Amino acid sequence: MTEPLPRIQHYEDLGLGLFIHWGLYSQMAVGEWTELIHHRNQHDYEQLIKTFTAAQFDAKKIAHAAKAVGAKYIVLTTKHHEGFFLYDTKGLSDFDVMHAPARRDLIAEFVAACREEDLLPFFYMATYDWHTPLYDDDFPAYLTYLQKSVEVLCRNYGPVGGFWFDGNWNKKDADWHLPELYGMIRHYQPNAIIVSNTGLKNQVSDPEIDVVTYERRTPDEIYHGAPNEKYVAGEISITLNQHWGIAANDLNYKSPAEMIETVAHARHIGANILVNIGLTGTGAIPAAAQTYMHLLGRWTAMAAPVLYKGRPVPVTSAHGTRDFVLHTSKHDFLCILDLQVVGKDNVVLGGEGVNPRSFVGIGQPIQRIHWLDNDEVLSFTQDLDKKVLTVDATGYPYGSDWVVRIAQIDYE
Amino acid sequence: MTEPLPRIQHYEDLGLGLFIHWGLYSQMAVGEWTELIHHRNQHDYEQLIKTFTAAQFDAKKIAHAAKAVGAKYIVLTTKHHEGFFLYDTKGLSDFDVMHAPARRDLIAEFVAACREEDLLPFFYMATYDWHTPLYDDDFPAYLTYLQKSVEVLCRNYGPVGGFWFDGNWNKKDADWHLPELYGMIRHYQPNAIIVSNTGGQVSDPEIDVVTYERRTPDEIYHGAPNEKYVAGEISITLNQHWGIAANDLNYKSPAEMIETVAHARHIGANILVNIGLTGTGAIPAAAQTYMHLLGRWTAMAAPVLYKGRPVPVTSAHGTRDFVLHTSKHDFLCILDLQVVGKDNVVLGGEGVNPRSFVGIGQPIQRIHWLDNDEVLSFTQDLDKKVLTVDATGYPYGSDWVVRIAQIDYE
Amino acid sequence: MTEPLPRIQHYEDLGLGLFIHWGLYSQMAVGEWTELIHHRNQHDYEQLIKTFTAAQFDAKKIAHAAKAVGAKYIVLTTKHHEGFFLYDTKGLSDFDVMHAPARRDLIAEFVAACREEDLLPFFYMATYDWHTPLYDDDFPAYLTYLQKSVEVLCRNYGPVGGFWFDGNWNKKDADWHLPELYGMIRHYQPNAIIVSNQVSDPEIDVVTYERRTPDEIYHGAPNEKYVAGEISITLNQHWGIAANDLNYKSPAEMIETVAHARHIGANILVNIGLTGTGAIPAAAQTYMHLLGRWTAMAAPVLYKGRPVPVTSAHGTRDFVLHTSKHDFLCILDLQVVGKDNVVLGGEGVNPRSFVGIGQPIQRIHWLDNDEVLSFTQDLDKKVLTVDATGYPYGSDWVVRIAQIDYE
Amino acid sequence: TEPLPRIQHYEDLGLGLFIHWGLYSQMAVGEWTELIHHRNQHDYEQLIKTFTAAQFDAKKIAHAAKAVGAKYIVLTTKHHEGFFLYDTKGLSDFDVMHAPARRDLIAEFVAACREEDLLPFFYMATYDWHTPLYDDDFPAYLTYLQKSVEVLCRNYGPVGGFWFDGNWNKKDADWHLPELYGMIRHYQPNAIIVSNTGGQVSDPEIDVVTYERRTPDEIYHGAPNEKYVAGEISITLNQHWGIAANDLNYKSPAEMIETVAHARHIGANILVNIGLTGTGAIPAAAQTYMHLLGRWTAMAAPVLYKGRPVPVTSAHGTRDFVLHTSKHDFLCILDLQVVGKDNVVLGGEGVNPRSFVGIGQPIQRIHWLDNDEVLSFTQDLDKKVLTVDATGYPYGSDWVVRIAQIDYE
After folding, report:
1. Under the phi-then-psi rule, with left for phi > 0, alpha for psi from -120 to 50, and beta for the rest, what region is B399?
2. Contacts (Cβ under 8 Å, ≥6 apart) of A282
3. SS3 call for A300
4. Which residue from B51, B47, B67 is spatially nearest to B59, judged by alpha carbons?
């Protein structure tokens, strides 16, 4: 049974990434699929190139914000279904940022900014393309165009963290020549992570795929490939409302609490997680996304000891709880949900009674257990023969609520 | 059954207010009850007065934000349990903003800012006080101190929208001399709404509004049959705390906020959305995000949010939908809709979506969504008072959480 | 809270009773409220007296079935809303069993059968009456009629376990003259338990609570008489037999309900509706057989076990009952244990915790098979954690009970 | 594709009775007791000596099936314990001919089914704990399994079907299904072959595949150019299939009724299981369930057998569904309450609009099957919406799943 290749091991250590949707669609703020979904006249929609100034895009600020949220990589949409490229395609197309008023290779600014902050730059590429008539009219030539667009990314920006391929609504059954495309990527970017949102066709879609995406609600530890074959990692994605590109009248935002639980859940099932934000037309992080990033950032700073290196382990929680354990080489960590805030005396807020939370699968004697957020030592008992650990999971100090609270176990 | 007195009818038309928690506790950003709950030394806590600059308090910005969110009044904490007064108590106490570096009557700034935006200013007053030893040592004198503190508010700021009394953790047995306190308010501010946290029987005839739990399932209680009608109000804060709490990450979804606002109207209550200011008096960025989202919803819902009332029209089994009545229209408030894709791209909302209601007996001419004016198809059975509409899903790129259809009668 | 009077104390030890609905309505088999709810013609409906033979009523079989199910008392409907009396009213009314072909005092047969099986006989009396015009047309005279009907029951059958009064709720404003009614009962039946479906009258011993009440019930104000509590469950949606009511509860929910009643400090009545002629229906027999297996296993705790301030861990429905010698863990949501490849759900260690046990424990064992459980305690925080093993293949008790033996 | 005629007939059966009875029945601690309780094999097998079948009456079994509205019966002819309830004619000594009963139970069973116009089906466990061949010589085990089926195919005349349980034990091994099934086709061309482990069928000869009871959506009928395969779900009354005396964890009759309706909604048959006592009697508990289910299936007879799923969905937040026959549609309506009167409110008295999408034809009349009450309704033919006022139950009744028949113009 295979173990991850070094570059995949590294990918798993990244833990959290920021996904950034930004394209011509951003100017209309009605979702990234607007051209197809709203049946827009193609010519009129493509005129959006003329007002693509990128006047507020600051890759340095974006990389800084990603670092502060505790992300270790960023996936930027280099070309979405609309087919507009955020980089210099060096003559491949006129529908690129060099032909917009911006006149800046935004991908170059992005990679430079990522490097300064020690973040891996990843490139999102949509394979279903609405711009080029090649897609319907001459699919083999389309493949060449797709491949060349990828090749430019592989050869003009230095080492790349990875590629994130999106083939939602792909041509069913057509030959995508993945071995040629992935093969080319390996030749120029041997170390790049290849991610696919259609990497599972029963069975990976190509040997060169490193990561497959999964739905955020996946209950159990994800699939890592057949037992004698290359280990493939997993990734889940969450966007803040219902849309990936900015959508001004989409008010259906998830709670910050659910965001935190999703990040925790991803780690529990052995996947990375991407948190998505949609930039404004001119390239700014919207205020709403800033709020979510600030809250997530406080959680990830507290969870830093386990968020990156923590792995799933055969330790289960007791009946009726959502609690789980993550393992690093030096420690185990209890991730504890559904805690309440502690009041005092007459003021009952919910958390003040003893709160025994049990786990099954810990066989080693424990010296100390403490909450990461405030270093409070927890009392506990063990039955080593049955591998039971029971901790008194105290509630939050008044004035705080971490949503997912983490206790570090220090072994005897 | 009595109907609301005019001032209470005006209150119910306010619909939505903003609650603002700001005090010395704000500087520690660990919740408004920190002094008691964290067992602080009183002297050390009360030193916070020395750094209360209010350097970033701008009542105009706050009034403007309230206007933009669609709120029609603001409840500001004038004195919380900590017992510090945000206004000039004119010698009643040294623990007031006049004795802080800010040196500004913040209530005066607040009332002026409310008037310029046509918002009603409401004053929150805690009756359980941790600062004055009168509270435990000389309760009759405490009553006089409480009453005098309210008297200052009734006499120094012009007409006031209302008072919001918080009796949480009070002495429930004691005689609070409510007739004298409320009576005094009636004398100076005949038109003020009196709201009570702990208003069986109402706690005093002069109470106009009583508070209710956020999740109360059914239309609220308005008082006994021959008695004065009392209105209701629910409150929601964005995380678990009312004052700012920097490490409280447990924020509710904006969607739940919108559903709570709609729910309050559905059960015949006003709703307060609470924000906790920073130590220096700024609206925190997180609160701004929620206000921006809520403001888009309330602008869309303006035709019904204020004048709409509960009416004996129920929704079909398995839905959370409900109806609000104004004098000219009924409005269907429809939940659990999905976004519409196109053809092969299925987002959830594209099939016909029959939503039914029971209790509409009049022939309908037209029904349309407030957000985009799309006309809905519908059928009626007038004898059984059934209405069924095809509630189309959201246009791609939008999601209103609670979608509202206006009914136009023949 | 005062200490319960001895009769009340005895009542709480009864634990489980059988409720029996049987009247003229039983012949129709469309529910006990049929006369009112189906708007029947009163004269035509009352003709059912002419075919009330009680040909299959055997009070001995009923008492035996109650004994076998582990019930300690039986509440029999002596007169329901329909207003027909199952006993000899000695001239009070012609609408009684002595004027039916049965021509037997069924209450007499019932009390004798209860006594021989050592069960307390309780009499159910409906106070909302559809038969006598007095009810609407002359309420004060109705009160006298009601009172006399109870007086017959208090004077003609020897000592009675109790009275179960249903239906003052019909007229919540009216003066029901409870002191005279209850006082009369106290005079002739000082030890009888008075159950009523601030408390309405000082003589009331027991108050009914809904089946779903979450918390330990109310026992009256401090310095006042302690009053007990009782909950009721029927097997489908109706109390009298209802042939086309297919909406029966699971036997599992029945067992959980009985367990729940004890947890909140109440007795529980399980209701059965007899057939027209007075037989226990086959469906009710099935439920009684299943309940009887559970109550036989739970006998150590079912009668004497009382609620105690010991709570269960987050996310479990488990609870604790206290007797003078032992505590008992009542554990829900267990699965059956498979073996090796065959995973049925119960085979991993299953830590279930409780908070409020401060004393060192010597042993814990399941009542059903005597298996000893492993456990750990933290005496300072009063935490007990047991490994609640799953059921042996081939069994499933729904509510499993572990007995704690203290050092 | 169109179902083969034998498969179409199977689908019309709707409901069957599953009967578990073997040596394990004597223990009353579940049918898997020998393995799960780690019993000594020799000691367990001695149970053959007290297998009298003294209370087995195949006519009572057939009668109970008839009364519940079942159209076939699946009897366990050999379970994992490996004991055969029929004469294996020299294949094995571990059969009913070597027990005190001395009668071929299968023969009695087939005769009793034929007299009630029920199809007899034979359940056969392919995972066998008795014969050492199973672990020690799998190819020879296959021959033994096949011969045991051959006896069933050749000694009883035409049979309704075979119900194979347990190739899931060795998921990798070659079970030689073409030879086993081919043999069955040769002697019993019209028999339904059901498989417990059947997006690819395990053999072309399989007619029916089993599915989980809780499957949400209409079942899979096979790839678009290939043989149509039917589906079946199973429910037992408690947690065990064989009798289990101290298993008190019985499902509600209401859940049983909902499961039967659910099977039909998803286009499957349903088997309701009963475990006989040691000596072969139907336990009283099973009789109670049968009687309750029988009242429902008698009321649902117009649609239970011929009703099929159809692209008509119910409104948001209801569990209602529609079944189609050639002459009618039927609304199956859940979560109704009983109707009180005036001040006595039982829950069902207000107008109760229940909607469906996908009916495009004008309707003349709609009425409840249980009492013939006519329902009021409105239609929007352009959007294919039907809304009915689903009145609650008459006091004294509660059908759990209520059925309204639609009569078209």
Report:
1. beta
2. A53, A54, A55, A56, A57
3. helix
4. B67
Inter-chain CB pairs, B–D, below 8 Å: 76
Residue linked to tokens 């209550």: B269
Residue B43: both structure tokens together? 């002297």
Resolution to one decimal, Å = 2.2
CA B267 from centroid of its chain's CA atoms: 14
* Six token digits for residue A304: 């830093």
Q: How far is C386 from chain A, CA to nearest CA, in Å?
A: 10
Specify whether the CB–CB gap between C402 and C365 falls below 8 A: yes
CB-based burial label for A105 (10 Å; 0-12, 13-18, 19+): buried
Name the burial class of residue C160, with classes exposed (0-12), middle (13-18) and buried (19+) by CB atoms within 10 angstroms of its CB: buried
d(CA B258, CA B277): 21
Kindly list the residues from chain A whose CB atom is less than 8 angstroms away from the CB atom of residue B286.
291, 294-295
Nearest to D310 by CA among D262, D276, D358: D358
* Helix ranges, A70-220 (H): 106-116, 134-137, 139-156, 178-188
CB A357, CB A323: distance < 8 Å? yes
- A390 and chain C: CB distance < 8 Å anywhere? yes
Q: How many CB atoms lie within 10 A of CB D5?
A: 9
Phi/psi at D185 (5° precision): -65, -40
CB distance D395 to C33 below 8 Å: yes
CB atoms within 10 A of CB A47: 11
Instruction: Provide, as residue numbers in chain B, all residues whose Cβ is less than 8 Å from the Cβ of D350.
Output: 314, 358
DSSP characters for C222-285?
TTS---EEEEEEESSS-SS-BTEE--PPPHHHHHHHHHHHHHTT-EEEEEEEPPTTSPPPHHHH
With b meaning 16 or more CB within 10 Å and e meaning fewer, what string describes D58-87?
Answer: beebbebbbbbbbbbbbbbbbbbbbbbbbb
CA of D384 vs chain B CAs: smallest distance (Å): 8
* Cα gap C283→C248, rounded to integer Å: 10
Domains along chain A with CATH numbers: 6-307 (3.20.20.80), 316-411 (2.60.40.1180)
Identify whether the C-beta of residue A102 lies closer than 8 Å to the C-beta of residue A59.
Answer: no
How does DSSP classify residue B4? -
Are the C-beta atoms of residues B345 and B329 closer than 8 Å to each other? no
Q: Are A251 and B297 in contact (CB under 8 A)?
A: yes
Within a 10 A sphere around the Cβ of D310, how many other Cβ atoms? 17
Extract the tokens encoding A290: 């800033």
Cβ contact C28–D295 (<8 Å): no
**Residues of chain B found within 8 Å of residue A252, distances taken between Cβ atoms:** 254-255, 399, 401
CA-nearest of A40, A32, A16 to A77 is: A32
Inter-chain residue contact C314 with A358, CB threshold 8 Å:
no
CA D19 to each of CA A85, A334, C98, D152, D295: distance values in angstroms, whole numbers, following the listed order: 67, 48, 49, 17, 20
The answer to whether D35 contacts C285, with C-beta atoms less than 8 Å apart, is no
Phi/psi for B232 (5° steps) reads -135, 155
